[PDB]
User: Fold cAMP-dependent protein kinase catalytic subunit alpha from Cricetulus griseus.
Amino acid sequence: EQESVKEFLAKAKEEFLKKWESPSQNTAQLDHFDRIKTLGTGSFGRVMLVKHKETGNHYAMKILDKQKVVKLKQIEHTLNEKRILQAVNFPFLVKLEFSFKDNSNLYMVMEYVPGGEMFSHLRRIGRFSEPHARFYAAQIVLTFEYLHSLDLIYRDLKPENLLIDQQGYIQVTDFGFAKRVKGRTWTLCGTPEYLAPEIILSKGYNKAVDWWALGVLIYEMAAGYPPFFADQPIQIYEKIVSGKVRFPSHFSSDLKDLLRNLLQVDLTKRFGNLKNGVNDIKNHKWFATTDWIAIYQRKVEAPFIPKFKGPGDTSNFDDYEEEEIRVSINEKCGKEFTEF
Ligand SMILES: COc1ccc(-c2noc(C(=O)O)c2[C@H](C)O)cc1
Ligand SMILES: COc1ccc(-c2noc(C(=O)O)c2[C@H](C)O)cc1
Assistant:
């Protein structure tokens, strides 16, 4: 790599480590915000649009029920999520603005990205052209270069986690499975269609699982469906471990070649995990037209700008039953979440 890239990554790691070793805590409280709308809901958490009462700024507030986090064995993962988010800084990562906890819940207050999930847009139009897929893919390549340099594995790449901003660029959200890992790690996590073979086979695995997931994402953007699709998890897993893939005839030869090298079952032969690291991806013929500096600087005109009316518009997200944010009179799970 050029000295300029080496010096940029060295500064990025220094700045990350300073916040990683001394994390911020307790930087807001719940009654500083008005609740507007639920934007999504899961097994132990929800995300809600909120407005700060004094400044009028909008934010996306992720709320985790401490008792449910414990029951679903996510304690370490939720502590990882907040400690990583308060320490990172990159153009294609959603920014954490505040965090706090109370007797019942954990709270992460993010910037709100009003354009919606990539997934919605992809499903509405069917598939993206190769230039359109390549613009988003280039942003993920740079983001993974940054995260991997800091010894972070992301472990949750999928179209639902890629939000489209007011300039039509990507911001990656949901660090619930992200982890600082210097060698190998072992937890079964991720979404079925995006899992690498070594995760499915219960091996010790490393950052190469993110590069496999990038191959699944590029395939899905350019085709409209993921490569290993099937009706039940066990059948998806059989396809993933098999070492074969079928490509639509509309794919270019360069796209097919790049995907065979990212979707390589043998992790020791997979692009992103060879001696030249990310440069085997950046220098591939499919990326020959990509100006990497111009993408990082946000100087390239985006394929499209999402339609929305302003920073409070929720029209690009869907509708959920609205439930209370109740806070108990007794502290739950205080020892488990001391460091949050
Ligand atoms: C992983 O993401 C990166 C973004 C950017 C750089 C970078 N590499 O060289 C320069 C330069 O200043 O010439 C830069 C930025 C624009 O400062 C490197 C990596
Ligand atoms: C240049 O090629 C494009 C492909 C796709 C889109 C697109 N992706 O999602 C939507 C949506 O309506 O959600 C659209 C447009 C605005 O209709 C835009 C441009």
About this structure: The domain at 5-22+117-307 is CATH 1.10.510.10 (Transferase(Phosphotransferase); domain 1). Residues 130-149 form the longest helix (20 residues).
